[PDB]
Design a protein around this ligand. Structure first.
Ligand SMILES: [Mg+2]
Ligand SMILES: [Mg+2]
Ligand SMILES: [Mg+2]
Ligand SMILES: [Mg+2]
Ligand SMILES: [Mg+2]
Ligand SMILES: [Mg+2]
Ligand SMILES: [Mg+2]
Ligand SMILES: [Mg+2]
Ligand SMILES: [Mg+2]
Ligand SMILES: [Mg+2]
Ligand SMILES: [Mg+2]
Ligand SMILES: [Mg+2]
Ligand SMILES: [Mg+2]
Ligand SMILES: [Mg+2]
Ligand SMILES: [Mg+2]
Ligand SMILES: [Mg+2]
Ligand SMILES: [Mg+2]
Ligand SMILES: [Mg+2]
Ligand SMILES: [Mg+2]
Ligand SMILES: [Mg+2]
Ligand SMILES: [Mg+2]
Ligand SMILES: [Mg+2]
Ligand SMILES: [Mg+2]
Ligand SMILES: [Mg+2]
Ligand SMILES: [Mg+2]
Ligand SMILES: [Mg+2]
Ligand SMILES: [Mg+2]
Ligand SMILES: [Mg+2]
Ligand SMILES: [Mg+2]
Ligand SMILES: [Mg+2]
Ligand SMILES: [Mg+2]
Ligand SMILES: [Mg+2]
Ligand SMILES: [Mg+2]
Ligand SMILES: [Mg+2]
Ligand SMILES: [Mg+2]
Ligand SMILES: [Mg+2]
Lengths: 242, 98, 125, 173
RNA sequence: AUUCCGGUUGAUCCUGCCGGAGGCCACUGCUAUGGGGGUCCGACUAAGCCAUGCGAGUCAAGGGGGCGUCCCUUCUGGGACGCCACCGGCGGACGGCUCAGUAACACGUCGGUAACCUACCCUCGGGAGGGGGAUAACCCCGGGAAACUGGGGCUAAUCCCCCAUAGGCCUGGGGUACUGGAAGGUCCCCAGGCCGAAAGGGAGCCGUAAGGCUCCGCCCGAGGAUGGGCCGGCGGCCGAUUAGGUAGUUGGUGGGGUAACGGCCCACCAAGCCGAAGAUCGGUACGGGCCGUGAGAGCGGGAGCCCGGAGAUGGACACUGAGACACGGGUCCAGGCCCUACGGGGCGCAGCAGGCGCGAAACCUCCGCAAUGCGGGAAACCGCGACGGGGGGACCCCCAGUGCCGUGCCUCUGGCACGGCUUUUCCGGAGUGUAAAAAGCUCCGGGAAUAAGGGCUGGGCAAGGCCGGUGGCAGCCGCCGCGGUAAUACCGGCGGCCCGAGUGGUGGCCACUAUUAUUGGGCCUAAAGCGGCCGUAGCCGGGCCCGUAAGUCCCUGGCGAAAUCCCACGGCUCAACCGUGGG
RNA sequence: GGUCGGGUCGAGCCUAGGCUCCGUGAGGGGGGAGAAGUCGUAACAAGGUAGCCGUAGGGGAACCUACGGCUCGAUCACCUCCU
RNA sequence: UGGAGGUGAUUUAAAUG
């Protein structure tokens, strides 16, 4: 980029979390800005063409998308560049199937089949929280979206809590706090895709991030960054996880 | 490198050898400098003429320099008027334009 | 014309040879020498990213504030002094920190008229 | 830096004219009817690489070393170069003759499908031999133990007829 | 393979350098049957100069027109249909090419921005009220050799301009709702100012109409995302026959300017700042992932693919825009060049092909948007010398051929004579393959037919003590050495050896070399201990007890892109190559 | 958009001063090969005056002489110091 | 048996291949 934004992406420089054959072609789809970030999502064309196999070429994948056959978090998505990320729900109603997008033990994105009932809810980690005009509270989530709450509720939400949201209506139905004994699922790092319970929380001076110790099912204790630990239940999971 | 022949000469071998080694003075196209080049083979000097163009390369001695009983000569002729000199000395081919 | 990129000198005193042309995003602009006049005059500058700046070139009024929180819009007589430049007071140049005299007394300017477009001052007792 | 360059799979001798090595290699070339030196050198290199992996694994310890140690043994017994109860030290007693006995040319001659090594080479090149239902025309292909006994004449070959004149002469040996 | 061999003497043992023997890269002599795979082919000299064609468009569901075929009536028309250009919108700042400049916060790596900008996209909270205006197209008349360009008439918009409201920014006084490690930040209430939104537009049905019901859209606010700007610590060349260097220089106070912090620039006050642990100056050079070689320690290189930087004949400088001081856009100077009716007007392939010049040194003025992607469009789609497909080339790597069998004879390796066999390869066909072709692959007919060279032959070093020429002449010779009429060494014949679709010559790097020595060398007589001594920095430093935890060791969090390397398994007949996992 | 005033920034151009580099260059100077045109015999044996180092003067040329030093000097006699 | 030092001396001329 000598003078302006980049609009292209070579296959060899594609993100490491995609399932893609890196030497078969020169170019890859450059994802459009949207909900998640580059390291935690993938364009929808690779879901339709490469993962599911409902289309052989890009041209007939686009015709499938334009007719409105794929839903992401309960909403119709037609853009083949749309980024699909961690904890989203991919729904195909004409075939009656639903999936949740989750990272692998190696850090790669995969589709986990789920029930039709569980497809109505999306968990959202609280990334930031602020005051807004009229003296109301804005909650900023991990997928980039936002919600408003009245000033009387300010003590029921804090950063790193998880909110279970009904989609596409966007209605709150449960708040899961971040504390000892909560159930967490790791989303990034060396211990990615491991899950368990919270034992201890540690803090440090001068803006170094805080760390958590987690006990798994077989009884082993391991550490990770606090912001890598995604609350999913009280003492049992509230969603289906592999 | 490529050059143009200015004259033919003969160099005496060093002691205790005896004989005359046939060579040419060559002016290089790229910078105009003049160097001496050996003409290998029996009767090879007869295939060279004044104003002819030659291709020269290293003679192959120690430290990338001269060899044998002829110190002072660092190069040898490989082509004459774009024909291989080895062929001409053996036969198998003729020197063009008379 | 006016370049704000980097010094051509190292802290040791040695010289630096430039390795590229001047980029457009590194340029400055002419200073606004805000004068005292009978009438006001301002202009609008289109800036980086398609933004705007209001540049005041001649000022006739000031907003004067007290320690109690009440403000009054009054006219400017002259510049008594300006510590920024030794000859601004002679020319009646107004910048942040200058001392101005108004109909209600002397005041110290708290605004940047070249950037904000207005003159705000605190009244000196 | 520099992008990848594809490199030779065989190594050349450090000195071209050593009498003892020349005699030994001439005997091998005559016995197995190889076409040129580089072919022989290819097999020599394969052997060397095996030994170099065993030498490194003996002096190693840890978790990845064990996985590599068992993978080397498993591959060697799949190719038929070691028996089922061999250990790592047995890798160091392998000879060049062990590898050449696994060539498809040699195995075609050993089973009695040809009368000579040269005839086995022509049978392979012309497309008369099938290996587990597939026709392979490379005489240097190394035969796995699991497919050694499913090696026959191609079902579309002239030789797949017990009354063919050339097959009867092969059977007379 | 953690290696040696020849050369100083009449003969010997050393030191020491030269040569031989291996790998990889560039040019090159002679010689060549087939296929497959790959990140190969005007980088070294000239970032020299360029004829011709092409390398960036798209939207009719934003808007008035031109013209045509038809339907209802038509004096006139209204409809539907299909092309054309213009106004208007978005893109043209990416992609592609090269390595001249640069020894620098350029690059690698860990952090910071509470000191910043961001059109297209995502979520949430709100808004779309009232007015005005010209103009292209089109018709009249034209100018100029041309490049271009003038006056009058008339017209529309999601074009342009105003009014209101919402909103934004600066300053002064209070309150403490939020995030954070920490508030010049966010939120609430008073006060003085300045700046200041929008297209309810378009399409389709249910509508007798009234009005719904969808789709694509317009503006403001908060946050994210995407693409960037700026800053710091640490790391990576050569020279002392370059020793002192700096004066907006280094810091402070008060301002300006910027998207933003800053001597970035000014006014005023001080004397600071760098340096023998190498400043300054000079030389050479784009940095990294990586690549060549070696048992390793090391030594050498950094064109091709990926990421970052820079440039568009040289030197300066602006307009539009979210983004440029813009390779196929604008201005000046300098230097070449093209067309002129002589008044004027234009052009720089370091895009793909192609030409000239330079040289030892590098290809077709071809086919396609079917695949991968990008821009535009509601969509079907359209364009793309990116990319994909072929054409030329001893680029690199992998797999094959130039016959096989039996019985006889010979000088028994191999050649010849009989009898038989096969068809990789070759010639002619059908199918599959392909965007279309070509290769490739499966079958059918013919037939051993269509296919071996280069170097060497005294020692090192595998291979002749044979024959014919020449006669210190001619010639050979990496080194040692041959040739003076009875040459195993020159030239040639016949033999023989090595490698083989290849094999020789020249130049470079590593190894050889413990001839650069940390691992690991030397200095009495061979190169080499200052003529002698005192001492500054540096390096090296005696025993015991208590403390600390910087060095050091162990465990565990966050990082060091992909490609490249090693292993197993799987897909192309195996392989080269490609995928899934481990390292 | 033209004309004028002022401020400020600025590639290029001119003159002079100093260093730096390439190209020719009358004349002068040693160095290396060649093979012998020439004069002598200095280094090797005690090489026919032992050789050599430092400094200084002299000579066609190798070289000679003076003061201080080294053995990397032959022979005979005597003396001293050791094993 | 074999070594290390010191002081004295040395009877004309005699080039070259
Ligand atoms: Mg922080
Ligand atoms: Mg590079
Ligand atoms: Mg000697
Ligand atoms: Mg050597
Ligand atoms: Mg060029
Ligand atoms: Mg452009
Ligand atoms: Mg560009
Ligand atoms: Mg420099
Ligand atoms: Mg940096
Ligand atoms: Mg540095
Ligand atoms: Mg307004
Ligand atoms: Mg400031
Ligand atoms: Mg350069
Ligand atoms: Mg470099
Ligand atoms: Mg290239
Ligand atoms: Mg050019
Ligand atoms: Mg070439
Ligand atoms: Mg070309
Ligand atoms: Mg679109
Ligand atoms: Mg021999
Ligand atoms: Mg030779
Ligand atoms: Mg003879
Ligand atoms: Mg001969
Ligand atoms: Mg030594
Ligand atoms: Mg001494
Ligand atoms: Mg001392
Ligand atoms: Mg001690
Ligand atoms: Mg420590
Ligand atoms: Mg990597
Ligand atoms: Mg297979
Ligand atoms: Mg395999
Ligand atoms: Mg791979
Ligand atoms: Mg004498
Ligand atoms: Mg005498
Ligand atoms: Mg004498
Ligand atoms: Mg005298």
């Amino acid at each position: 980029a000598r003078k302006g934004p980049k609009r292209h992406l070579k296959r060899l420089a594609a993100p490491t979390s995609w399932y893609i054959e890196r030497k078969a072609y020169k170019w890859a789809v450059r994802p459009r800005p949207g909900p998640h970030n580059m390291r935690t999502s993938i364009p929808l064309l690779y879901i339709v063409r490469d993962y599911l196999g409902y289309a052989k070429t890009a041209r007939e994948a686009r015709k499938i998308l334009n007719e409105g056959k794929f839903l992401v978090d309960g909403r119709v998505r037609k853009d083949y560049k749309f980024p699909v990320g961690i904890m989203d729900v991919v729904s195909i109603p004409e075939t009656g199937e639903h999936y949740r997008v989750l990272p692998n033990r190696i850090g790669k994105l995969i589709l986990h089949p789920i029930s039709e009932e569980e497809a109505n809810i999306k968990p959202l980690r609280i990334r930031n929280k602020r005051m807004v005009k009229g003296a109301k509270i804005q909650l900023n989530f991990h997928d980039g979206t936002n919600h408003l709450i009245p000033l009387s509720e300010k003590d029921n939400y804090f950063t790193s809590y998880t909110v279970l949201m009904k989609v596409p209506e966007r209605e709150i139905l449960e708040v899961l706090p971040f504390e000892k004994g909560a159930y967490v699922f790791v989303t990034q790092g060396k211990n990615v895709a491991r899950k368990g319970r919270i034992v201890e929380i540690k803090k440090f001076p001068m803006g170094w991030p805080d760390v958590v110790t987690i006990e798994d099912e077989e009884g082993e204790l391991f550490d990770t960054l606090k912001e890598y630990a995604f609350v999913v239940g009280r003492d049992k999971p509230r969603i289906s996880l592999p | 490198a490529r050059g143009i022949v200015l004259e033919k000469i003969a160099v005496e071998a060093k002691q205790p050898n005896s004989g005359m080694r046939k060579a040419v003075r060559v002016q290089l196209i790229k910078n105009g400098k003049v160097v001496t080049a050996f003409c290998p083979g029996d009767g090879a000097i007869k295939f060279i003429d004044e104003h002819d163009e030659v291709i020269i390369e290293g003679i192959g001695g120690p430290k990338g320099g001269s060899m044998g009983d002829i110190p002072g000569i660092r190069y040898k002729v490989v082509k004459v008027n774009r024909v291989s000199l080895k062929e001409l000395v053996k036969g198998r081919k003729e020197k063009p334009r008379r | 014309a006016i370049w704000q990129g980097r010094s051509l000198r190292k802290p040791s005193g040695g010289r630096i040879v430039l390795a590229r042309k001047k980029r457009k995003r590194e340029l400055g602009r002419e200073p606004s020498n805000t004068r005292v006049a009978e009438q006001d005059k301002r202009k609008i500058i289109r800036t980086y990213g398609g933004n705007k700046k209001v540049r005041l070139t001649a000022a006739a009024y000031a907003n004067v504030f007290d320690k109690s929180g009440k403000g009054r819009k009054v006219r400017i007589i002259r510049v008594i002094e300006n510590p920024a430049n030794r000859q601004f007071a002679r020319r009646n140049i107004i910048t942040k920190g200058a001392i101005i005299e108004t109909e209600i007394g002397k005041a110290k300017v708290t605004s940047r008229p070249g950037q904000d477009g207005v003159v705000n001052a605190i009244l000196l007792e | 830096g520099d992008p990848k360059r594809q490199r030779k799979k065989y190594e050349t001798p450090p000195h071209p004219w050593i009498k003892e090595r020349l005699d030994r290699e001439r005997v091998l070339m005559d016995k197995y009817e190889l076409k040129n030196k580089k072919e022989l050198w290819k097999h020599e290199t394969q052997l060397k690489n095996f030994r170099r992996r065993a030498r490194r694994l003996l002096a190693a310890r840890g978790k990845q070393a064990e996985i590599e140690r068992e993978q080397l043994l498993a591959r060697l017994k799949r190719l038929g170069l070691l028996p089922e109860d061999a250990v790592l030290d047995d890798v160091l007693s392998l000879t060049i003759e062990d590898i050449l006995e696994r060539r498809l040319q040699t195995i075609v001659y050993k089973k009695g499908l040809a009368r000579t090594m040269r005839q086995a080479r022509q049978l392979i090149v012309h497309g008369h031999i099938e290996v587990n239902g597939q026709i392979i025309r490379s005489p240097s292909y190394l035969v796995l133990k699991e497919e050694e006994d499913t090696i026959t004449y191609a079902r579309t070959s002239p030789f797949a007829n017990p009354q063919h004149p050339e097959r009867m002469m092969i059977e007379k040996a």
